[PDB]
Design an enzyme around this catalytic site. Structure first.
Site, mmCIF file in Angstrom:
data_model
loop_
_atom_site.group_PDB
_atom_site.id
_atom_site.type_symbol
_atom_site.label_atom_id
_atom_site.label_comp_id
_atom_site.label_asym_id
_atom_site.label_seq_id
_atom_site.Cartn_x
_atom_site.Cartn_y
_atom_site.Cartn_z
ATOM 1 N NE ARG A 155 3.861 4.810 1.348
ATOM 2 C CZ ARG A 155 2.853 5.384 2.014
ATOM 3 N NH1 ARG A 155 3.084 6.301 2.947
ATOM 4 N NH2 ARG A 155 1.597 5.036 1.750
ATOM 5 C CE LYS A 159 3.061 5.801 -2.819
ATOM 6 N NZ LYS A 159 2.193 6.924 -3.283
ATOM 7 C CG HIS A 178 -0.082 2.874 -1.708
ATOM 8 N ND1 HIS A 178 -0.976 3.873 -1.823
ATOM 9 C CD2 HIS A 178 0.954 3.356 -0.898
ATOM 10 C CE1 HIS A 178 -0.531 4.940 -1.134
ATOM 11 N NE2 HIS A 178 0.649 4.616 -0.567
ATOM 12 N N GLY A 236 -1.989 2.460 5.227
ATOM 13 C CA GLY A 236 -3.421 2.217 5.355
ATOM 14 C C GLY A 236 -4.261 2.631 4.176
#
Length: 290
Positions: free
Chosen positions: A226, A187, A224, A221
């Site tokens: 993934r 992430k 950041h 959402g």
């Protein structure tokens, strides 16, 4: 799991304190025959103190359950006090105790914060203030969003001027490890919430394409990305829809930060565009494979 898998309230000193569960109280409860009427009521092995309500039966790995959590491990208590310190830092009302405890959270996000709080090289180890904040968020009880400084963790495999990229270590986890052995996921937290220069953005994107060319750039959402392999975007699509499904339930302020179109894989941006904008399952799903 629900927060109530880990601790139970206690109206003491005129307000609510959270006490962690004894792994054997739980273990006792799992063998109990209980009345249908008390299935949602805190259990009482008389030996090992209070247990969770026997409805959370499946959230616990047993002899005939490989699908739950390993509540017997050291990791269990660690997470539980983690959650406990955090909640006790809020002063929680009779109004909220129920939704707070029924709040569906990530075990794995919390175990990574354990591992962060404890390693002396991490500021989390040193700034309790910062620790709380990281916990409150993963627990969903703060306005704020996950910056890098407050991130779940893993191994930084790339650091930028405005990003930090984490390799998610879920195979080796102790409380609830990823049982699939191919698993690889990263992430990418934003170093700050602010605006990001084309220098930085292009850098990040250059990195993503040379180094991780085999990975889908997605988002759930929050603030950041993934970084999933292409065979998972599927399961990812269905899960992300289901939580926007529970929009049919206000208080879930569904601010879906569909981030910079420049980093996000094009089909995810298509897919997420439709859903965030009221479309049905299938006109969304079709955007993703076309």
């Amino acid at each position: 799991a629900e927060l109530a898998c880990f601790c139970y309230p206690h109206l003491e000193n005129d307000s609510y304190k959270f006490i962690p569960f004894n792994n054997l109280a739980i273990k006792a409860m799992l063998t109990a025959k209980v009345d249908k009427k008390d299935m949602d009521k805190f259990y009482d092995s008389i030996i090992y103190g209070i247990a969770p309500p026997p409805q959370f039966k499946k959230r616990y790995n047993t002899n005939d359950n490989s699908r739950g959590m390993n509540f017997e491990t050291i990791m269990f208590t660690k997470v539980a006090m983690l959650i406990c310190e955090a909640l006790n830092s809020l002063k929680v009302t009779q109004a909220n105790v129920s939704n707070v405890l029924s709040r569906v959270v990530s075990i794995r996000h919390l175990e990574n914060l354990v591992i962060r709080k404890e390693n002396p090289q991490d500021i989390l180890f040193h700034s309790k203030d910062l620790l709380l904040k990281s916990t409150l968020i993963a627990i969903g009880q703060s306005k704020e969003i996950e910056t890098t400084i407050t991130a779940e963790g893993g191994e930084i495999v790339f650091q930028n001027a405005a990003f930090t990229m984490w390799k998610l270590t879920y195979l080796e986890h102790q409380l609830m490890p990823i049982l699939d052995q191919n698993f690889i996921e990263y992430k990418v937290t934003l170093n700050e919430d602010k605006p990001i220069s084309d220098v930085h953005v292009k850098e990040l994107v250059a990195e993503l394409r040379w180094q991780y060319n085999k990975f889908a750039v997605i988002t759930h959402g929050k603030g950041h990305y993934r970084i999933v392999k292409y065979s998972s975007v599927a399961n990812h699509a269905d899960r992300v829809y289901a939580t926007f499904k529970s929009n049919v339930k206000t208080g879930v302020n569904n601010d879906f930060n569909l981030l910079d179109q420049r980093i996000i894989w094009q089909n995810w941006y298509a897919f997420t565009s439709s859903m965030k904008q009221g479309n049905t399952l299938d006109v969304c799903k079709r955007l993703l494979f076309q």
